[PDB]
Ligand SMILES: Cc1cc2c(cc1-n1nnc3cc(C(=O)O)ccc31)C(C)(C)CCC2(C)C
Ligand SMILES: Cc1cc2c(cc1-n1nnc3cc(C(=O)O)ccc31)C(C)(C)CCC2(C)C
Ligand SMILES: Cc1cc2c(cc1-n1nnc3cc(C(=O)O)ccc31)C(C)(C)CCC2(C)C
Ligand SMILES: Cc1cc2c(cc1-n1nnc3cc(C(=O)O)ccc31)C(C)(C)CCC2(C)C
Ligand SMILES: Cc1cc2c(cc1-n1nnc3cc(C(=O)O)ccc31)C(C)(C)CCC2(C)C
Ligand SMILES: Cc1cc2c(cc1-n1nnc3cc(C(=O)O)ccc31)C(C)(C)CCC2(C)C
Ligand SMILES: [Br-]
Ligand SMILES: [Br-]
C-alpha cells in the first residue's frame with residue numbers, strides 16, 4: 001500500500017529534519033517550546049528548499065529523497081501545475097543558474113529555521129540574534145569563496161521571499177497531497193470496499 | 199514512537215468505519231464501484247463532521263471523538279483552529295442539541311450527503327440523485343409521523359447542510375484534524391528527540 | 396470601463412437593499428442586524444440571481460448589464476473551475492427543474508434570513524422569519540407542482556451548492572478576474588502615459 | 592456624496608496613480624517596455640503600498656496611519672474581522688521599522704527592489720529587470736555601510752523584511768484588507784441611510 005509507504009517516508013523526513021536542526025549551533029540551547037515553534041513554522045519551507053536544490057540535476061522535474069522523479073506533466077495532471085512551475089522557475093532554476101552550493105543552502109535553511117517572526121516565541125530577540133549570527137557567516141563565506149561576485153550574498157537572501165510565497169501556495173493547493181495523484185487514494189478505498197462485511 | 203504513521207493509521211480506521219457504514223446504506227453497493235469511491239471521497243469530510251458533532255451533544259464546550267477523546271475549546275484555540283471549532287459548536291452541535299435531532303434523522307442527513315449527485319466524475323448522477331430523493335422522502339415521512347406538531351422540522355434538518363458544507367471546507371482549509379488529533383503525538387515525538395543527544 | 400464596473404456594483408448594491416426591504420418583516424429587525432444579514436449574504440444572493448438569469452443562456456453567464464460571459468473567457472481568466480461549478484451545480488439544475496422566479500425569491504429570502512450570521516442580536520428572530528418563508532415555499536410548491544412531491548426539498552438542496560460556490564468565488568477572486576487582464580492593463584497604461 | 596463603491600474605487604484610483612508617478616521617478620524604470628512596466632506594477636502594488644503606510648505608521652502606536660491622515664486603531668481592525676493581519680503588519684513591519692530606525696532612503700530602495708521583481712510572470716526581459724534590482728541593492732549596501740558603519744548587518748536586516756512583506760501582502764489580498772478597512776464605513780453608512788428610508 002503506497003499510503004503507508006508515504007506516511008513512513010514523512011516520518012523519516014521529520015526525523016532527519018529534527019536531527020539536522022539539533023546539529024545547527026545554539027539551536028538546542030533555545031527553550032524547548034521555542035524549538036517546536038520554529039520547526040512547525042518552518043518545516044514546509046525547509047523541505048521545499050531541500051528538494052528544490054536537490055532537483056538542480058533534474059530537468060522539468062523534482063527529485064525526491066526517495067529517488068523518485070516527479071515530472072511537470074504529473075503535476076499539471078494532478079492540478080498543481082502552476083506552483084510546480086513556480087518551484088521550477090523561482091527556486092530550482094535560480095539555484096542552478098547561480099550554482100548555489102550546499103553550504104549556502106544550509107545557511108539559508110538555518111536562517112529560515114531561525115524565524116523571529118514565528119508566533120508564540122518566548123524570546124524572539126534570542127532567535128533573531130542567532131539568525132544574525134548565521135547570515136554574518138554566510139556573507140563571509142560568499143565574500144571569500146566568490147569574491148568576483150560581490151552581490152552573491154544578497155542574491156541568496158532574495159530567494160527567501162519566493163520561498164515564503166511558494167511555501168504558502170503549496171499548503172493552499174494541497175501540493176504534497178496532490179502529488180500522490182489520488183490513484184493511491186482510490187486504490188485505498190477500493191480495497192476497503194471489496195473487504196468482507198457484516 | 200512514529201507520529202505520522204500513527205496518525206495515518208488512525209485516519210485509516212475512521213475511513214474504514216465510514217466505508218462499512220456506507221455499504222449498510224440501502225442501494226449504495228448496487229452503484230458502480232467507481233461511483234462509490236467518488237461519493238466517499240467527496241463526502242467523507244462532512245460525513246465525519248456530522249458524526250462527531252451529533253456525538254458531542256452530551257458534551258459542553260467541547261467535541262467528543264469516536265476514540266473517546268474529549269477535546270476542549272481551549273486546546274482548539276491553542277492549536278490555532280478556534281474559529282472553526284466555535285462554528286462547529288454553534289452551527290452544528292448546539293443546533294442539533296436544541297432541536298433534539300435523533301439518530302434516525304442524523305443517519306438520513308448523512309445518507310443525503312453521501313448520495314451527492316454534484317460529485318465530479320460520476321458515471322450516472324441521475325442514479326445517485328434518485329437515491330437521494332428516496333432518502334429525504336423517507337426523512338420527511340419520519341418527521342411528520344414522529345414530530346407532527348413540528349411541520350417545519352424536515353426543512354430545518356435540510357437547512358443544516360449548508361452549514362455542514364462550509365464548515366467542511368474550512369476544516370480542510372485550516373487542517374482541522376491534523377491540528378487536533380495530530381498535534382500531541384507529533385509534539386511529544388519532537389520534544390523527546392530534542393531532549394535527546 | 397473600471398468606472399462602469401464600479402457604478403454597476405453601486406447599482407447592484409442599491410437594488411439588493413431595496414429588494415431586501417420589500418421582503419416582509421425584514422425592516423422590522425434591528426438595523427444592525429439588517430446590515431449583518433446583507434453583508435453575510437450578498438455574495439450568495441447575487442450568485443443566485445445571475446445564475447437563474449442565465450437559464451436562457453448556453454455555456455455562459457448573463458449579467459444584469461446585458462453582458463454575456465462565455466466559458467472560454469472564464470477558463471482563460473483562470474477561473475474556469477468555479478464557472479463550471481456555477482453552470483453545472485446551479486444554472487443547469489435551475490434550468491432542468493424549471494425553477495420559477497417565485498421559488499428563486501423564496502430561496503434568496505431564506506439565504507437573507509441566515510440565523511448563523513455572526514453578531515446577530517437576536518438569531519431566533521431571524522430563524523423564525525426563515526421558518527415563515529420556507530413554510531410558504533412548500534405551500535407554493537405543493538399547489539403549483541403537486542405531481543412533484545419532492546420539489547420543495549430539491550430547492551433547499553441547492554443551498555449547499557450555493558454556499559460552497561459562494562466561498563470558492565471569493566477565494567478565487569471570481570468577479571475580479573471576470574473583467575480580465577485588459578481593463579486593469581488599460582487602466583495602468585493610461586496612468587503611465589500621463590504627464591509626469 | 593453617495594455611491595460608496597464608486598467613492599471607494601476613486602480612492603484606490605488615486606493611490607495607484609501616486610504609486611505610478613513614484614515608479615516613473617525611479618531611474619531606468621521608464622526605459623523598460625511599457626507592457627513590462629504594467630506587469631511589475633500589478634505584481635508589486637500591494638506590497639509597495641503596504642511598505643509605504645507601514646513606515647508612515649512609525650510615529651503612531653497600535654495603529655496604521657493612512658495617506659489621508661486617517662488613524663486606524665487595532666480594535667477597528669479586529670472588529671472589521673482583519674485583526675490577525677493588522678497585528679502581523681504592526682509586529683513584523685511597523686515595529687521592526689521603528690526599532691531599527693529605517694530611514695526614507697532605505698525604504699525607497701526596498702520598494703525599488705520590490706518593484707523590480709524579476710519573478711513577475713510574462714516579463715519580456717526578466718534579466719533586464721533583475722539587473723536593475725541588482726543595481727539598487729548594490730547602492731543600498733553602500734548607503735548602509737557609509738551611514739551606519741557600526742551596523743555591519745543592517746543591509747541584510749533590511750532585505751530580510753521582504754519575506755514578511757511577501758506573506759503579509761498575500762494575506763492582505765486574501766482577507767480583503769483594504770476593502771474592510773477603507774470601505775466598511777462608507778458602505779455601512781450608505782446601507783444604514785437606505786434602510787431607515789421609506
Ligand atoms: C512533503 C512533506 C511535508 C511535510 C512533512 C513531510 C513531507 N514529506 N514526506 N515525504 C517527503 C519526502 C520528501 C523528499 O523525498 O524530498 C520531502 C518531504 C516529504 C513533514 C512530515 C515534515 C511534516 C511537515 C510537512 C507536512 C510540510
Ligand atoms: C495535513 C497533512 C497530512 C499529511 C501530509 C501532509 C499534510 N500537510 N500538508 N500540508 C501541511 C502543512 C502543515 C503545516 O504547515 O502545519 C502540516 C501538514 C501538512 C503528508 C504529505 C506528510 C502525508 C501524510 C499526511 C497525509 C498525514
Ligand atoms: C479521518 C481523518 C482524515 C485525515 C486525518 C485524520 C483523520 N482522523 N484520524 N483520526 C480521526 C478521528 C476522528 C474522530 O475521532 O472523529 C476523526 C478524524 C480522524 C489526518 C489528520 C491524517 C489528515 C489526513 C486526513 C484529512 C485524511
Ligand atoms: C460581483 C459583485 C460582487 C459584490 C457586489 C457587486 C457585484 N457586482 N457588480 N456588478 C454586478 C453585476 C451582477 C449581475 O449582473 O448580476 C451581479 C453582481 C455584480 C457588491 C457591490 C454587492 C458587494 C458584494 C460583492 C463584492 C459580492
Ligand atoms: C474587494 C472587492 C472590490 C470590488 C469588487 C469586489 C470585491 N470583492 N471581491 N470579493 C469580495 C468579497 C467581499 C466580501 O464577501 O466581504 C467583499 C468584496 C469583494 C467588485 C467586483 C464589486 C468591483 C468593485 C471593487 C473592485 C471595489
Ligand atoms: C489601493 C487600494 C486598492 C483597493 C482598494 C482600496 C485601495 N485603497 N484605497 N485607498 C487607499 C488608501 C491607502 C492608504 O492610505 O495607504 C491604501 C490603499 C487604498 C479597495 C478597497 C477598492 C479594494 C480594491 C483594491 C484592493 C484594488
Ligand atoms: Br501559484
Ligand atoms: Br533577485
Ligand SMILES: [Br-]
Pocket residue numbers: 165
Ligand atoms: Br507571489
Ligand SMILES: [Br-]
Pocket residue numbers: 281282285368
Ligand atoms: Br472559520
Ligand SMILES: [Br-]
Pocket residue numbers: 354357358510522525
Ligand atoms: Br435554519
Ligand SMILES: [Br-]
Pocket residue numbers: 476477480563
Ligand atoms: Br472549484
Ligand SMILES: [Br-]
Pocket residue numbers: 315327330549552553
Ligand atoms: Br439534490
Ligand SMILES: [Br-]
Pocket residue numbers: 609610613643
Ligand atoms: Br507611493
Ligand SMILES: [Br-]
Pocket residue numbers: 675676679762
Ligand atoms: Br494572518
Ligand SMILES: [Br-]
Pocket residue numbers: 695698699702
Ligand atoms: Br518610498
Ligand SMILES: [Br-]
Pocket residue numbers: 116128131748751
Ligand atoms: Br530578521
